[PDB]
């Protein structure tokens, strides 16, 4: 089955290269470029699977896992839902060729099918990565969110199916050692808040830099420098690093971060004498590991491996201008080294759940109004995107509609309705007393 999966992953990879018109390097396809790394991390994530849980018949269970993992490094690469459809057809043809005979009852690849090694940690399984059902995922995330609210700063979110899937595939990139996560989406997509949650789900400690109005390159270096002191110590939880487009006030602040995220740590971050004192602390660990000590070559190397494993870099950009594309062109490390993750707009089914959550704890005549309003809230936002597509073709004037725009609209509507209802109630009470 291993050999078949290698020919399969190639077959899918090869059918995409053949369709140069569909997928190619472009201005808006700076990342679309298909490397070894995406095949490598696919091959890496199979190696993550422990023997004891995958022991037995691997005719049904492996192809599912592979297909998922394959899908999550290719879907995120694609921006358009058209490109997605083309890929799924190539993936089915590829599987059906190498496997030969497979049941038509259950599609090998399916949107419902997710794989995560955080669900295992909740159920008391140790280093286990398997397929998790949508309803099980809901219960774990909802429980963990209550734990996050208890200790860290309270974050409200809808926790719809598509947002939860986005939590799963970020948790997955953080579980892989050395590999860095890149989140791309429009302003308000929840990605920064989904990352902070996703980090907390796993056993990792998130550290975001705070940018003041007046900031300097040397001030950034000192914030990073502090983070590397916590990683250097042997018995340390792996530090995640959070960055957004707003946090990057100038392009000079990005240069250090890319050299960190590419490999090891930025050249001449600390002095040579300070580096020597960090190396000595790691030497005590190396004895326990059983790696060659007092070699001063393999040890220094081992220090760079540990630092790489314990530093995770999370980047957040918006693909709205050609400024992000200029970042890709300028900064080579970012697009190739990190694992891209693209946020699509919220589905019609998800928007209904958002409205249904905000309408809760508001009085209504029969609460059937609530369930209907929640539909109309989704229908109105969708009908704007269809009108916005019509507006883009008809006139040169560009309008943009984001999920934060939608959230803020709902809060304003709710406040206006509550104020009008309160005024009407006061007037009716006065009229009743007078009567």
């Amino acid at each position: 089955m291993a050999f078949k999966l290698v020919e399969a992953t190639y077959f899918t990879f090869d059918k995409i290269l053949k369709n140069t018109t569909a997928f190619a390097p472009s201005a808006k396809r700076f990342h679309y470029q298909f490397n070894f790394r995406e095949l490598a991390r696919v091959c890496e994530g199979i190696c993550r699977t422990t023997p004891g849980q995958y022991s037995g018949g691997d005719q049904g269970k492996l192809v599912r896992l592979w297909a998922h993992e394959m899908k999550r490094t290719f879907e995120d690469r694609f921006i358009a839902n058209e490109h997605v459809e083309f890929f799924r057809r190539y993936l089915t043809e590829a599987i059906s060729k190498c496997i030969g005979e497979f049941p038509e009852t259950e599609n090998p690849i399916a949107e419902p099918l997710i794989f995560t090694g955080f669900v295992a940690a909740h159920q008391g399984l140790d280093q286990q990565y398997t397929q998790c059902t949508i309803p099980v995922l809901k219960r774990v995330l909802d429980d963990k969110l209550e734990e996050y609210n208890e200790v860290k700063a309270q974050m409200n979110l809808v926790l719809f199916q598509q947002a939860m899937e986005h939590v799963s595939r970020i948790c997955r990139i953080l579980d892989m050692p050395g590999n860095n996560a890149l989140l791309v989406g429009v302003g308000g997509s929840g990605k920064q808040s989904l990352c902070r949650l996703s980090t907390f789900i796993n056993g990792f400690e998130i550290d975001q830099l705070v940018v003041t109005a007046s900031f300097t390159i040397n001030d950034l270096r000192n914030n990073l420098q502090e983070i590397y002191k916590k990683i250097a110590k042997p018995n340390s939880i792996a530090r995640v690093f959070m960055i957004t487009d707003s946090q990057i006030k100038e392009e000079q602040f990005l240069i250090p971060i890319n050299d960190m995220l590419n490999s090891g740590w930025i050249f001449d971050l600390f002095p040579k004498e300070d580096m020597d004192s960090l190396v000595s602390g790691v030497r005590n660990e190396a004895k326990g590991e059983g790696v060659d000590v007092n070699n001063l070559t393999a040890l220094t190397s081992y220090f760079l491996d540990k630092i790489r494993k314990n530093l995770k870099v999370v980047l957040c950009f918006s693909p709205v201008g050609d400024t992000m594309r200029i970042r890709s062109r300028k900064f080579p490390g970012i697009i190739n080294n990190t694992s891209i993750d693209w946020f699509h707009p919220w589905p019609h089914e998800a928007l209904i759940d958002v409205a249904f959550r905000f309408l809760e704890e508001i009085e209504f005549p029969t609460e059937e109004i609530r369930q209907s309003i929640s539909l109309n809230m989704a229908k109105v936002h969708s009908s704007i995107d269809t009108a916005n597509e019509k507006f883009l073709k008809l006139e040169r004037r560009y309008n943009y509609t984001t999920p934060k725009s939608f959230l803020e609209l709902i809060d304003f509507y709710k406040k206006l309705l509550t104020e009008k209802r309160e005024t009407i109630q006061r007037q009716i009470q006065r009229y009743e007393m007078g009567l």
């Binding site: 470029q33 490397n35 070894f36 000079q252 890319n258 490999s263 001449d268 080579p332 490390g333 190739n336």
Partner: protein, 96 residues
Amino acid sequence: ATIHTTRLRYMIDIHLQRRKPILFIGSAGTGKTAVVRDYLNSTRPEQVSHKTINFSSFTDSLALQKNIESMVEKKNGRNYGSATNKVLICFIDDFN
């Protein structure tokens, strides 16, 4: 190891004995950096002394010299080279 890497691996050993530098070209996917990075580990740390340099598109000529200065030890006179006749290798990535 691959058929393609082993034959390039031989070409590097040939090109390391000589003072002739090597330049690798190909797409992002091809896996050049790793093939060089494997070799630098397999080389003896006394004979050859390896260092990686990565340009992020803001690396000025002055900043490159600071990286070279640190790599090269101070020989007798104006000349700067490694002590005990060690050969100094500087690896460059994202050259263009």
